[PDB]
Amino acid sequence: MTYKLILNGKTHKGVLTIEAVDAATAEKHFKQHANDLGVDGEWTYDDATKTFTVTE
Amino acid sequence: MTYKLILNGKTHKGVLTIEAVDAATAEKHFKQHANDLGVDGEWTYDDATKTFTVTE
Ligand SMILES: [Cl-]
Ligand SMILES: [Cl-]
Ligand SMILES: [Cl-]
Ligand SMILES: [Cl-]
Ligand SMILES: [Cl-]
Ligand SMILES: [Cl-]
Ligand code: NA
Ligand code: NA
Ligand code: NA
Ligand code: NA
Ligand SMILES: [Zn+2]
Ligand SMILES: [Zn+2]
Ligand SMILES: [Zn+2]
Ligand SMILES: [Zn+2]
């Protein structure tokens, strides 16, 4: 299914959408993106919208 | 305005949307994302949809 990441970082404000087999796979991918971007924030997940938020 | 990046990398297939004052500013931001993700691809731009694509 489609999963989304809302980036709410100091220098990264955006929305990323990907496809993944499950939420765990999406979250692993999203955490790698955030790590590569130097985003070090607090994570939340909304199951109803399959949307993660990372907030610095 | 809103600008989009279609990631068509070997390991990064996704869509990123951001806001930016102009296409040049969006593209600079997008190129930094792609650099941070280790995406080394060919860039194209569609003015009508304010959408870049990076293709490995
Ligand atoms: Cl699907
Ligand atoms: Cl961003
Ligand atoms: Cl973690
Ligand atoms: Cl705007
Ligand atoms: Cl991606
Ligand atoms: Cl360049
Ligand atoms: Na996957
Ligand atoms: Na879920
Ligand atoms: Na900007
Ligand atoms: Na344009
Ligand atoms: Zn799927
Ligand atoms: Zn960004
Ligand atoms: Zn704008
Ligand atoms: Zn990716």
Give me the CATH number covering residue A49: 3.10.20.10
Read off φ and ψ for residue A53, nearest 5 degrees.
-125, 135
Is the four-CA dihedral A12, A16, A20, A22 of positive or negative sign? positive
CA of residue B6 relative to chain centroid, distance: 6
Q: Which residue has the tokens 């610095």?
A: A56
Best CA proximity match to B7, nearest among B54, B42, B46, B44: B54
User: Which one of A18, A36, A38 has the shortest CB-CB distance to B13?
Assistant: A18
The distance from CA A23 to its chain's CA centroid, rounded to whole angstroms, is 10
DSSP 8-state class, residue B50: T
How many beta-carbon pairs below 8 A join chains A and B? Answer: 24
Question: Which amino acid does the sequence have at A31?
Answer: K
What's the CA gap between B35 and A14, in Å, rounded? Answer: 17
Task: Check if the beta carbon of residue B50 is closer than 8 Å to that of residue B23.
Answer: yes
B48 φψ region: left (φ > 0), alpha (ψ -120 to 50), beta (else): alpha
Q: Amino acid letter at A17?
A: T
For residue B12, give how far its alpha carbon lies from the nearest alpha carbon of chain A (Å). Answer: 9
Residue B33: closest CA among chain A residues belongs to which residue? A37
Range of the domain at A21: 1-56
Helix, strand or coil for residue B45?
strand
A13 interface with B at CB cutoff 8 Å: yes
Q: Which residues pair with B51 in a beta bridge?
A: B4, B46
Separation between Cα atoms, residue B30 and residue A38, nearest integer Å: 15
Give the total number of structural domains in chain B: 1
Resolution for the entry shown, Å: 1.3
